[PDB]
Amino acid sequence: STEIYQAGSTPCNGVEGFNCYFPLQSYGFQPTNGVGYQPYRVVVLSFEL
Amino acid sequence: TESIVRFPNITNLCPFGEVFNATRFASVYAWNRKRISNCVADYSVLYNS
C-alpha cells in the first residue's frame, strides 16, 4: 500500500504535502559509497517443522 | 468492564524545543546536558517527525 502518512490533520485525500508524506523512500547506492552504506543482498531461509 | 486512568488536572508541556531547537550546540568533548521532569512530555513527535 502507498497510503500517504498522516502527521497532521486527519484528512489527506491522498495528496502529498505538509504533514503528508509518502510511505516509501528510495535507497541510494554508488560504487564510491562506504562499506557501511554499501548495498548487501540478504537471503533468509526459514525451515518448517 | 472499563479502563480508567488519572493524573494531575493541570500540567505544563515539557520544553523540548529549547534543547532540540537550541540555537547552538556544544562540542563533543563538552556535550551539553539538560535535565527535565515534572512536566508532560509528548513523545509522539519524536517518531512522527
* Nine cell digits for residue A43: 537471503
CA dihedral A26, A31, A37, A43 (to 10 degrees): 80
* C-alpha atoms less than 13 angstroms from C-alpha of B12 in its C-beta half-sphere: 7
Amino acid (one-letter) located at B24: R
- Cα separation, A12 vs A9, in Å, equals 7
How far is Cα B13 from Cα B1, in angstroms, rounded to an integer? Answer: 32
Question: What's the one-letter identity of residue A3?
Answer: E
Q: Residue B2 CB: number of other CB atoms within 10 A?
A: 3
- Which value in Å is the resolution of this experimental model? 3.6
